[PDB]
Design a protein around this nucleic acid. Structure first.
Ligand SMILES: N=C(N)NOCC[C@H](N)C(=O)O
Ligand SMILES: N=C(N)NOCC[C@H](N)C(=O)O
Ligand SMILES: N=C(N)NOCC[C@H](N)C(=O)O
Ligand SMILES: N=C(N)NOCC[C@H](N)C(=O)O
Ligand SMILES: N=C(N)NOCC[C@H](N)C(=O)O
Ligand SMILES: N=C(N)NOCC[C@H](N)C(=O)O
Lengths: 154, 149, 154, 154, 149, 149
DNA sequence: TTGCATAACGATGCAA
DNA sequence: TTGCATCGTTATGCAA
DNA sequence: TTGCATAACGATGCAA
DNA sequence: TTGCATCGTTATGCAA
DNA sequence: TTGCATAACGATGCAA
DNA sequence: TTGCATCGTTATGCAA
């Protein structure tokens, strides 16, 4: 199935050097498993696979971090956001496509900045006031779902 | 902090926020390093005479109490490790730098500490001007911030 | 009916010391009137009844203010908001779940703060720019309804 | 048809001095063309016709600018906005009734101010954070349509 | 104010706001204490040469006029009772405190008064720095604010 | 600028914005006067070792590079024509005025230039306070700004 | 004095 | 509008 | 000069 | 697109 | 070194 | 969930 294909992908990547998704499709094909690039795109996105390279390092090869870090540049953005939510998030709420977050006075800009830097797929953008942040959910995510996601980190 | 200090913080918290529940109050307290349970907050609010106030057709209510602050500078010192990138000075001004967006948060904590050598603060986005009370200089203020770290 | 039940409630409260809604249900029952706690919750909310107590005052008893004040702490939040709307609100408008309020330059924060402090049931939160405030309506209230409510006070 | 009626209107205005739409209806009637005030309102709005007058100049007469300026006061609110969008707009996006615009750090207020001053018919209002602007679309315009309009100027 | 002063305010108002109607203009004027009816505003705007301007497919239009201010300091003094919590100073700075969020509003009114002894202002959320023009000191500025109350 | 300078700007740009595409990077660069095509940016980002980073279920990614600035003051000088309405001073402060809303944008560019004679800046809405490093005076700073125009 | 576990209490979406 | 069922919110007996 | 009351004027949701 | 009906917005005769 | 044109590559709305 | 078809995004051979 899917989770089996993905296990094979984490394996094929750590052992080989895949530079493209079509390339990973052929690597899976010779191994019996047949998938399209479309699906691998989805898998790698779920896997958190990142096309890596060093300075002057040309086209990268895919690699999934083992909760080990992306060298130097943390990913990291999300963990930092989670820490600041735990510290600064006072309440969450929602209406339509909006999650509304409250913070202590003056803290909204700092928390919103942390959320922007996490670059969440379901967030179109944020605006901070002084103690309130409007977070715009990317369709079809609702404000209520976005809010629940923030709540779970509160 | 202890009962009396925590309750002073609570009064401060309730005047600047709109607190709908003891759970919210706990989150506001935890933001300044104070961690207590809902049972304690129930007791604090009773001792304080705090009431969950609402008008006509007014929903569920918010807590208010009828009519410096303890740990004030410790709340401020607490944030310096996180939010103080650097200090500097010129004449009667200390100039503090913070991560992007953090200036108002740290400046608010400086204000609440109500230091007698500080006339006031203004925050931009990543910079705070702290105005020294004569004859204290900006340099001394900066030194105070560096020492509270 | 309802308004009759409520008249009795304003009466039962000023004469007795009701510490719970179930208690007010029994006080109404012995008086013939049968209601559930659910309805009393709604009535007290409409009535603006507040569970009052002094310092170290234990569990409160319900009391409805007679446009007399809630001692020291004004309610009060609403009147102040209404005054600042009259003074600072330049225009109201709406879209979807949003009321959009305009103020003179620089006044938006101050007006938004007043609205937050009123803690209106139909407002999820506010964000102030410099001369514009976005007010997020709590479902099912629409932005247009919220805006009309602010208009009425303009 | 319509574009023919409008060509006649640009003509009737530059040659005569029309002080009201009902007046422009009679001027078109004597010329065969029959329309209501409602339609002329729509035409003049599309035409960009403006009721002009000088200081102490009483009731104005309609005039459509020939990309020549409205004397002194630029109409140019729009041109200025277009210039600043070209300079400052980093990306556009949308959700529901919202267009979300991103700018370099610190530029959001300045760009949002420019958009306000353009007073676009399909914009209810704007709020600026530091690098993000929420633009509220006036129903029935969607956020996506608003965003595309800004994209076109990016 | 009278005709000439009110019309000066109107010009100032029309350049910083986007005014779609005379009703809006009345609300903007009422915010700075000036109360007149729509009839008077119709007449003011005519005397001013103000036009309701719009481009192509441009909607209903906003008022603009082609090409200190009267009562400027009175508009500022007007707000002090409301918005001035306290004044203080240090060197060339006066430090004003306001209710939460009110700093930009009061600072804007200070700016419009264009006092010759004031180089400029910066507002945070509840604090304004007013920069004194040499050799005026912050203390004298603070005294001026206290006296205008 | 040339390869090395442009790439320095890119590093600065990538740390303060969340850049999802080379197209976005081009818009950010164009905002500070640098115009290059996507092909060049592809090459810049490769030379920089920049990676399009994302976590688990993390969407499409944003560019980051592992681990003052060239043309810094020219970026600042660039904006003065647009954004500097006037300069003035008092003691250790230069006071800059900008069009409404522009203060943060110009102050950010001043900060990035990192002038040794400038301790820091605070922006309001239309005013910037630039704090002079002793013994430089606010007047000299103002003169520097007027000369960079 | 506090936390814990639980009881008492108040609010609310849904169907009628 | 209400009641029902249920859930979020607040109070409190007991151990430490 | 201003407010009041009202008339003149322009804009707009709805059906066709 | 247009017209109808209507409403929000702006101009103006008269009393003071 | 860069731009241009184009190829290679990755993401995604829709139907199944 | 997947594949298809397609589109937005990124890489690269060649002229200058
Ligand atoms: N500005 C202060 N002190 N409070 O007002 C905040 C208003 C609004 N919730 C906002 O966050 O924009
Ligand atoms: N606004 C952004 N992102 N940066 O600019 C900050 C300018 C200035 N140091 C201040 O803190 O006001
Ligand atoms: N910042 C100035 N001066 N005006 O711009 C305001 C932009 C936007 N309406 C806002 O209120 O955020
Ligand atoms: N304040 C800084 N430096 N960044 O935070 C931005 C938060 C949010 N996108 C906003 O524009 O309000
Ligand atoms: N932002 C809030 N809520 N308070 O902080 C204000 C800090 C400082 N006095 C200033 O007015 O900038
Ligand atoms: N906020 C507006 N619209 N004006 O007020 C500006 C006040 C002050 N000069 C500052 O720039 O902070």
């Amino acid at each position: 199935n899917r989770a089996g294909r993905q296990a094979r992908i984490v394996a094929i990547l750590s052992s080989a050097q895949v530079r493209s998704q079509n390339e990973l499709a052929a690597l899976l094909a010779a191994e019996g498993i047949e998938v399209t690039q479309a699906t691998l795109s989805r898998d790698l996105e779920e896997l958190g696979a990142v096309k890596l390279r060093g300075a002057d390092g040309g086209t990268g090869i895919y690699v999934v971090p083992e909760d080990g870090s992306p060298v130097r540049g943390v990913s990291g953005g999300t963990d930092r956001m989670a820490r600041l939510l735990g510290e600064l998030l006072v309440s969450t709420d929602d209406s339509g496509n909006l999650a509304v977050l409250r913070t202590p006075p003056g803290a909204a800009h700092y928390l919103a900045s942390a959320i922007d830097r996490a670059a969440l797929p379901q967030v179109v953008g944020t605006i901070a006031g002084d103690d309130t942040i409007l977070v715009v959910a990317r369709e079809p995510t609702t404000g209520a779902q976005l809010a629940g996601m923030f709540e779970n980190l509160r």
